Amino acid sequence: MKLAPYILELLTSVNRTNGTADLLVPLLRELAKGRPVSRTTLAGILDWPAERVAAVLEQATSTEYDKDGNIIGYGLTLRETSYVFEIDDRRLYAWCALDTLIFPALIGRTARVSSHCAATGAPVSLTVSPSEIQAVEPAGMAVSLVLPQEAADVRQSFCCHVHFFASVPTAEDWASKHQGLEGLAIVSVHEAFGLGQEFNRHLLQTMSS
Ligand SMILES: [Hg+2]
């Protein structure tokens, strides 16, 4: 299928005015350590004034915080979700299926990913590296995509509709009942990993390194 629309709308959500583009990789790498991340820590890493870090995070309405206002979750999170993202010995979580395929190349780490099929509840797992997916169980694993909505809570508009499934036909059966979701598409997990790769290389071209 055509995946350019998904790649395009994904990266315009982060490339938005005061978007997470430049902050994303360092924040993901910090969250990957399994501890809450302060804005002063992020400021020190980015060499940004506190004002700019706060302004970027302000627009990211889905960001998860703790009692101290420290960052607990942005795509990658310390709060339990249905997507388990095990990197090193730490048990972390992601907001959706696609995130788990995207994050490893950005962190520069290999992750053990696991979840359950959204249509049936059957367990699913795979290993995601910076350049490859492996140990895909079951083999015919599929992923749900929707077109991201620009000024909408990313979690409710995108993340909650992006699942793993036991198989393509299983996901196709599920999708036929959810035809009110804009740009809903069923791809294999390998097609979804390629989507993330296209996102990542396009993201890195605009990161002002
Ligand atoms: Hg997501």
The CATH number that applies at residue 118 is 3.30.450.410
* One-character DSSP codes across the chain: ---HHHHHHHHHHHSSTT-SHHHHHHHHHHHTTTS-B-HHHHHHHHT--HHHHHHHHHH-TT-EE-TTS-EEEESEESS--SEEEEETTEEEEESSHHHHHHHHHHHT--EEEEEE-TTT--EEEEEE-SS-EEEEESTT-EEEE-PPPTTS-HHHHTGGG--EES-HHHHHHHHTT-TTSTT-EEEEHHHHHHHHHHHHHHHHHTS--
123 vs 112: CA distance, rounded Å: 14
How was this one solved? X-ray
135 vs 125: CA distance, rounded Å: 7
Return the active site residues: 96, 99, 159
Kindly give, in sequence order, each residue whose CB lies less than 8 Å from that of residue 174, ignoring residues fewer than 6 positions away.
118, 119, 144, 165
Q: Exposed/middle/buried for 179, CB within 10 Å: 0-12, 13-18, 19+?
A: exposed
Q: How many domains does the chain have?
A: 1
User: Residues with beta carbon < 5 A to ion ligand 1?
Assistant: 95-96, 99, 159
Contacts of residues 131-138 at CB distance under 8 Å and 24 or more positions apart, as own/partner, are: 131/105, 133/101, 133/189, 133/190, 133/193, 136/189, 136/190, 138/166, 138/167
Tokens linked to 164:
């793993």
- The domain containing residue 184 runs over which residues? 1-209
φ, ψ of residue 60 to 5 degrees: the values are: -80, 80
Nearest to 169 by CA among 154, 186, 152, 181: 186
Cα distances from 83 to residues 34, 107, 117, 187, in angstroms, run 15, 17, 11, 18
68 vs 71: CA distance, rounded Å: 9
Residue whose entry in the numeric block shows the structure tokens 């002063």: 40
β 90-94/76-77 pair status = antiparallel
Q: Ligand 1 centre and the CA of 95: distance in Å?
A: 5
Q: Ligand 1 centre and the CA of 170: distance in Å?
A: 21
The residues facing 93 across adjacent strands are 77, 84
43 vs 109: CA distance, rounded Å: 23
Q: Ligand 1 centre and the CA of 112: distance in Å?
A: 17
Q: Ligand 1 centre and the CA of 100: distance in Å?
A: 9
